[PDB]
Design a protein around this ligand. Sequence first.
Ligand SMILES: Nc1ncnc2c1ncn2[C@@H]1O[C@H](COP(=O)(O)OP(=O)(O)OP(=O)(O)O)[C@@H](O)[C@H]1O
Ligand SMILES: [Mg+2]
Length: 294
Amino acid sequence: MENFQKVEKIGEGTYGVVYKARNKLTGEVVALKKIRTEGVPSTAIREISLLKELNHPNIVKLLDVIHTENKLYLVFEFLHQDLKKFMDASALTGIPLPLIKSYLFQLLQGLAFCHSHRVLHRDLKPQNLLINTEGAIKLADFGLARAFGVPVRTYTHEVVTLWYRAPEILLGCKYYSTAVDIWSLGCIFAEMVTRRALFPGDSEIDQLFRIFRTLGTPDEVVWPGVTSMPDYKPSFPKWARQDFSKVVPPLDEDGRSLLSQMLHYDPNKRISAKAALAHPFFQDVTKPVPHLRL
Ligand SMILES: Nc1ncnc2c1ncn2[C@@H]1O[C@H](COP(=O)(O)OP(=O)(O)OP(=O)(O)O)[C@@H](O)[C@H]1O
Ligand SMILES: [Mg+2]
């Protein structure tokens, strides 16, 4: 755009290309997102503008929204690294637990704030979690799924990841709640600990089955109303639940107890972000500084 000098292309997502850019009227470096044709949905533009007012220290700030020439560009504060990159960097040594506990604690603070404002993310993944050199972590793209309605292939025909998708979304549930974000966070939490994605599905059905082989095929006892879900089939194979001690070693009792609450099949049983902040797992949380290399 005319007021921005694009420095680099940080990447491409489901919603468009992200560029590091410098504002010429301010000199500040920002993240500019060109959003992926009738002049931009008035509904979309009103949802985004709502977000401008939702400010929290653990939420990547939406600075500006620019619908010019009937085009949408979102200007966000810029953070140097995403958690995906960070994990790939700490793969041999693992992210230390005190760092894992600080990050999860901050993510829950961010979720609890958005959730109390009835704002859901619905697309949590490591690429949407940004970190700085101070030991802070922030949620990026909060609320854009609402605004634009999540696609299958990214703006650049890249297949979108289902790994963090909650089972109710996979079973065809149209009105999902804030619990969907808790499920996603649960999956990321487990990945950070083991250094391996919990449920790396490559199709909607493969995704569902990986979840089922681990947590057991849900039934009416554990998830009331599950058998009436749109995509539920009586023909689903029946798997037993695996032991969490076998799923997430070497997480202690507190961590395992917290994770199982985050991964409850029944969305209404799933722990809220605010209740998770009080879990004994956080009894000793601190704020360590990462091992960043820019
Ligand atoms: N404010 C930001 N500052 C720095 N880099 C960012 C910022 N927003 C996103 N990025 C990075 O740019 C890349 C692309 O982001 P984008 O959000 O388009 O991709 P994605 O997060 O993997 O998928 P989706 O488009 O669904 O959110 C990823 O590294 C993301 O972490
Ligand atoms: Mg993103």
